[PDB]
Design an enzyme around this catalytic site. Structure first.
Site: not given
Lengths: 126, 126, 126, 126
Positions: C14-15
Site C-alpha cells: 500500500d501507499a
C-alpha cells in the site's frame, strides 16, 4: 450517464502511492451494481433467477493517478446493446480532472449456456 | 515467449466460482516481474535507481474461466518497443485451453517527468 | 513445521510502502493450501467431497514490515486438534527477522451442518 | 459506538459464496477512516503532517457469513488509549445478526521512531 461517487481507500493504493490499476475494474463493477440497483433490478436478484452476467472483455486507459482519500466519480454509459451482448463505457473524473476511461463487454448465461439478453434485463439496461 | 506458471488461490475467486476478472491484471504484473528478474534486472532495482514504470492502458479478453486450484501459464511477449513506450502481450493457458488474451502498454518516469526508456532498460526488454 | 516460501508482489503493498496487513491472511491461506497438498489431500478435493472448512477466528501480530520483492517463509504448525476444530499457528520470517506471528482456528461443515473432523482429514492434519 | 454502514461487493466474495475473511480487516480500516473524518481529522491529514499509524495486531472472530449485496454495519469503539498505543473494537451486524467481533491495536511513528500519541490525535480518538 449514470454517476457513481466513490472515495479511495488506503488498501486500494500500492507502494507507488497510487491506486493499483487492477482496482479500477473493481470500481467499474461497483458502478454497474449501483446502476442496476437504481433501475430496480439488482444483479443479486438476477443471480437468484439463475442468470449470470459474463465478462467478455475489459479495457482501461489511465490518464492521471488516484491517491488515497481522493473522491472521484465514475460516469457510466450504455454504449452497445445487441441480442447477446452489451457494452458499458466509464469515464473517471476527480473534480474536473479526467483520471481514466474504460469499457467492458458482457454476455449472459443461464443453465450453462449463452442466452439472448432477457427482455426483463433489456428493460433496465436501456 | 517468457512463460510464467501460477496456481489459482482461493481468495482470487468470487461467488461465481471463477477468478475475478480484476485478478488477471495482477497475474500479468507477476509475469512481468518474473520476466525482468529472469533478465537480471528486477523492477525493484529499477525503483531503487529512482525509475518508475507507469501503466498507460490494459486490455483483457476472457475466453474460458479459471477455477480454484487451476494451474495455468501466462505466455508473455514483448509486442512494441519505442523511444518512450513498450507493450507486452499475454496469452493465458490452462493445460491446452486458451483462457484469456491481454496486453498492457507502459512508459517510464523519473523525477516526475516522462523520460525516454533508458538504454539499461531497453537491453533487458529485448 | 511446514515451510511455505513466498515473494511479495507489488499489488500486495500500500501507499505506506509495506504489505497491507489484510494480505497476511492471504499468505496464511496459501501456506495451509500447500500444506494439505503436500500431504496428498488438497482442499480442492475436500470441497469436491462437499466438505467446507470454516474459519472461526484469526489473529496476527506484526513485528517488522514486508516490502515489495521481499522473500519470506511462513512456518506453519498444527497447534490444536479437537473433535470439531483445529488451530494452526504461523511464524513469518524474512531471512532471520521475525516479521509476524499468527494463528487461525477452523471447523468443518457438510450439508449445512457442523461435522466432526472426518478421519480422512485428521489423517492429513496430523 | 461510531456506526459505519457498508454493502458487500461481488469481488469481496470467494468461491464459497461468502466474504473472504481477509476483507473484514479492510472493512475495519474503512470504519476507522470514516470515524477520524467524522471528527474533522482525517488520516490523510495526519499523513500529510508526517504522522503514520502502525498496526500492531488484529483479531477477528467470525460468527455468521456475509453474502454478496448484504448491507451491514460496523460498530466501532475505542477500547484502550495509553501513552503510545490505542485499541479499537468492532462488532459487525447484518440486520439483527451478529456477524463478527474484532479488535486492532495501533501505535504511531514519526521520523522512523515510535512516538507518544500527539495531543492532537488524542483529542480526536476520545
Amino acid at each position: 450517464p449514470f454517476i457513481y461517487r466513490r472515495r479511495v481507500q488506503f488498501y486500494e493504493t500500492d507502494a507507488q502511492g497510487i491506486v493499483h490499476h487492477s482496482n479500477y475494474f473493481r470500481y467499474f463493477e461497483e458502478a454497474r451494481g449501483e446502476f442496476l440497483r437504481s433501475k430496480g433490478f439488482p444483479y443479486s436478484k438476477m443471480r437468484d433467477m439463475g442468470l449470470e452476467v459474463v465478462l467478455l472483455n475489459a479495457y482501461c486507459e489511465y490518464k492521471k493517478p488516484l491517491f488515497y482519500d481522493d473522491v472521484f466519480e465514475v460516469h457510466l454509459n450504455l454504449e452497445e446493446l445487441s441480442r447477446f451482448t452489451f457494452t458499458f463505457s466509464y469515464i473517471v473524473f476527480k473534480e474536473d480532472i479526467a483520471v481514466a476511461k474504460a469499457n467492458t463487454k458482457h454476455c449472459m448465461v443461464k443453465n450453462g449456456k449463452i442466452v439472448s439478453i432477457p427482455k426483463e434485463v433489456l428493460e433496465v439496461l436501456k
